[model samples]
Target: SSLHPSIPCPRGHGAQKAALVLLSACLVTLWGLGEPPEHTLRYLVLHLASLQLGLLLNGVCSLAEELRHIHSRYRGSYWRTVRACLGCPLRRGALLLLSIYFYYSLPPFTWMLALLGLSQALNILLGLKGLAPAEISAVCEKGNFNVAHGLAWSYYIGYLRLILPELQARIRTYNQHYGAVSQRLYILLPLDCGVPDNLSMADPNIRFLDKLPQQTGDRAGIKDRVYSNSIYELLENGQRAGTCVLEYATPLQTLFAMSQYSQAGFSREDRLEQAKLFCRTLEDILADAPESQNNCRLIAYQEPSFSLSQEVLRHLRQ
Candidate 1:
């Protein structure tokens, strides 16, 4: 009903307390000589490690939340999906991993000091702006370096509102008529000019192919639908029907993963039920495409043609 979450972090904290948290750094740096006398070492390192680990865990939790919206935003572009999903994660994941490495792998006192300072500074800034409802423990960028544990759960839930139930309804219908769909389905949502600034903002997009969850009782599966910008570039290339065209869009530049979706083939020809469903889908796009005087237009159509591979020929013998 609203775009907010449990407005506090670790129960309670104010700006002043979060700021005071930073002073621990001076005491620790001055105390630890990088060589611990086991006597005093136990007390100092334990608490330091606790909060350092706390921030790392929170940093990662924030990443988990951020990735959902990345999909909500980047699911459009063919290249940006890999770039944002694949490349950016590796880059961000490694950063958190390195922070851990630098902490555990180095002199305990040194790395903890740096992470501690950064965490509290983030808390103070967020607290002062009142952008946060509670004092957060850790932070990361992606939404202007805000609280990682989500002052942004609202955005994540907002994203689910956009993608989830409608998808569930579509999958449910497929099961009702057909008894069950094939192993997978590629759901391409309508094309849009751009993804919006926030989940609650306008201009939505998604194409859920196989990010779907496994089916449950009476439910076929999940939301993995999307649509992006190649169509716009085609129009821009000056070949647009009564418009312009320019196909200068980028392509996927690298391969980051070996385990891709199964290459299971489709029906040799549209079956009766499938064709009925597809024609309805076509009607929707065509109807919605140009008439609103919107950015999207179902400018052209091409009949699909096909040829059989050796595997297909072998199956025909049956």
Candidate 2:
């Protein structure tokens, strides 16, 4: 049969094992109480110290493995990875070792054994409290004793609760700034702008195309150069807001446009700045155009309000 219905077997087994091991060690020490003074004292000190060292070693190894796993799965910087693993099971194990060493060194053998058993049981229980029903079932069924036994589930849960909210906040802030820029850009009418007749408006180049004498993969053919330059209408909401005449844009302006187009690597503050800058620049360009002289009043886009908290709560539930 299984162990605790809410708690899994491996963690309980770990607690039980720790209790048995320490109790047996104490019993052996008790048996040696009748031996010579020097031998008994040496045995007690050495045995207790050895056990502490063993616990410390196990904790460190577990921590290292957990860190490695987190690093492999994490996509962000080193500090971010460290933050994610703050509540890892291996970390609790290391803390548990410190407590065991402190208490196990004091007093009578019976008391020491009892303290050790209690500490071990408490540690296992703490680990169990954070585990989800699915995770508990998987670990118990697979008989993966390592994580199931030693890792504290509460720490993992705490880590998620802390970091997930922060990540979601950043994402929401980015979307807000990004959407504002898109909204402003969406309202400008590109076809109405006054410019030289020689300057032509055209569609942006297609990312991929079918070859004439059709080729596949690396053998695809390139189209012969046709027009030297063209103007393209920029979309804000789905309607054209403004025109981009290729030759009119400076090199720096083009670079800014590319950066503003995608919100990939920038932080929240940076994205907000970029969005504001794009809106200002576009307004200036439109103001200079002859057709926009009489219709200079651009309507601000209204974004629908949404709850970030609800989204995060949904994610947590999943």
Candidate 3:
């Protein structure tokens, strides 16, 4: 069924078309056979009504599925992906039930139903250009063919194709706005590295000594640090093995919430609430950490807004 150049994929051309034909035929027959022979007005009205309802439901499902797919694929951190995977099934089920209920209840409104159907068809076409229709179909099938189920599938796609970039952008914007003004954080790991002074706190690339020897000020006595370099190499190796090594740090969440609260201008109490929420999020990260003592310990320190560079260093030493 796929064309030479611009034709639809064989599966899309065949299966989707067949399904459409079958569903259309079934609805048409139901509408035509149930009414009086001479009541042309009622028959036309009811027939169109059923078709429209079907289309509208299909459209909604298509959108929902797009959103769901997006969320599944590009959730920035590890915990969001885990939560989505666990909750997706229930969400899809609920959407399916709701779509079916609406479809069944909105009877005889043929115009609206037709619009829905057309919207769904267009959504399928658009989504397929950006997704594998078969996969989407599987999601829909799993959700039991309710328009709500389709919507869930659409939701996934929308999130992946459309919403993910937006979310990332927002994350970056929030980071920049709040992170610039937030308290400086430092981690004096059990190694030798000359950490940078406070004026350059906003620079993420600034490196600190990861390991310094006892004769710290003596250049000849100091050795080049290797832990940070080793960590990078380990990360690369883990990627090859389809594993990601994520070391959780409490300061990450604390900073994240601080950034969000500052940017949003939340009240003092609201900021405190936000901090608690951030704690919970950090706990989730801690809960998922791989079992290894080496992986568990991350030195975290935060400097107050007005602390001097020397003071911060003194605190670290203490």
Candidate 4:
């Protein structure tokens, strides 16, 4: 499928949000306990319950909306859509609930505050990953076809603007250092990373997967699947000895997996990362094609942008 599927939550942010919730809960308890016992106990329970009840309603609302996306042939049922939508707030609520339990049975809510503070801090540490600055804020600040299509468009543009230049620099410098033939370089883009001109083969040494013919879309009926060259080339200039193949990323780069595939996934972080503009693994990239070791690469974007665009182009043209 040309569509990049849904992605999972960012590991760090989820923890960050959870950590925020916990610390806030601790603070609320301390402040509440400082008040007269009669009212403190009454309103604290009331406030906690009402707050959690609101979140519960919010979570359900989120899940319900997710279900809307799920039914639309969204690949992942509960985990992909449901957990991503519900994960953060749900976890936050769960942690908040723990404070309630601590209060009912315990020592001045001191243990509750201390444990929450300690645990949240731990998860915050655990969630750490090297982050780019523009990424951090847009993200620390922080979408389907409406999300899916919008995401795909943003991905292509972002990659072209943010990443391509770096890769272009890499092609000239990175491969030149090794001096392997083919330049032994691959410039993989996403199926969704097309800007029309990016695919132009007028440049020298740039071989597209030969002129193989294939049907793309329908004139009047439903548009079917599409295909493109397995590998294409994008050489910055003739002097560069390194060879490059500009191709699309597979499932790993698709929206489902975020930019790169992971078992649990870095959907939020990478999405944040991409816009801030994004690696799955080198193994998967170089492994599939025997073209050259470490030379092959996939373009970074969503759901085969080229394929989707090609289909759209054809579909619209007709």
Using TM-score as the measure, name the better of candidate 3 and candidate 4. Answer: 4
Residue 66, model 4, lDDT: 76
After TM-score superposition, the amount by which residue 63's alpha carbon in candidate 1 deviates from its true location, in angstroms, is 7.1
* Candidate 2 vs 4: which has more lDDT: 4
- Model 3: per-residue Cα lDDT over 1-318, one tens digit each: 110122122133576888999989977986878965446555565565455445445545544544566655745444444344443545555655555455466443345556666766776678743557557645544455433233323423332223222333343454465422112123232111113333235332222322111111222355542211101001122231111111222233333444456564534443333333233333333345442212222232333343223333343333
Query: Which candidate has the highest lDDT of all?
Result: 4
The models' CA-based lDDT, in order, is 0.33, 0.37, 0.37, 0.44
Of 1 and 4, which scores higher on lDDT? 4
Q: What's the best-to-worst order under lDDT?
A: 4, 2, 3, 1
Q: Compose the digit string of candidate 1's lDDT tens values, residues 225-244.
A: 34221111011123321111
* TM, every model: 0.18, 0.18, 0.22, 0.31
Per-candidate RMSD, Å: 23.2, 22.6, 22.4, 16.2
lDDT of 2 at 272: 33
Q: Which stretches of candidate 1 lie over 4 Å from their true place?
A: 1-72, 77-91, 100-318
Q: Candidate 2: deviation at residue 206, Å?
A: 64
lDDT of 2 by residue, 1-318 (tens): 111122212234665799999999987887877666666566666566546544544444345556666646665355445445454546655755654555456445446555655665566557843678657545644563322122222222322223222333343454464422111111221111212232223222201111111112221264442222222333433554443212221222333344456654433333333333333444444546443333222322212353322222232223
lDDT at residue 53 of model 4 (Cα atoms) = 43
Which ranges of candidate 2 are over 4 A from the true structure? 1-33, 36-42, 58-68, 71-318
In candidate 2, what residue range of length 10 has the lowest lDDT sum? 206-215
lDDT of 4 by residue, 1-318 (tens): 121223223334566898999989987887877866766666677557445544444455457767777857567566667566556656766756775674565434555445545554454458643578746544543412123334434444433223333333444553455423232223444433222443444234454443223325443465654433323432334432222334443322445354455664556544533432223222332345343334333334454113322322232222
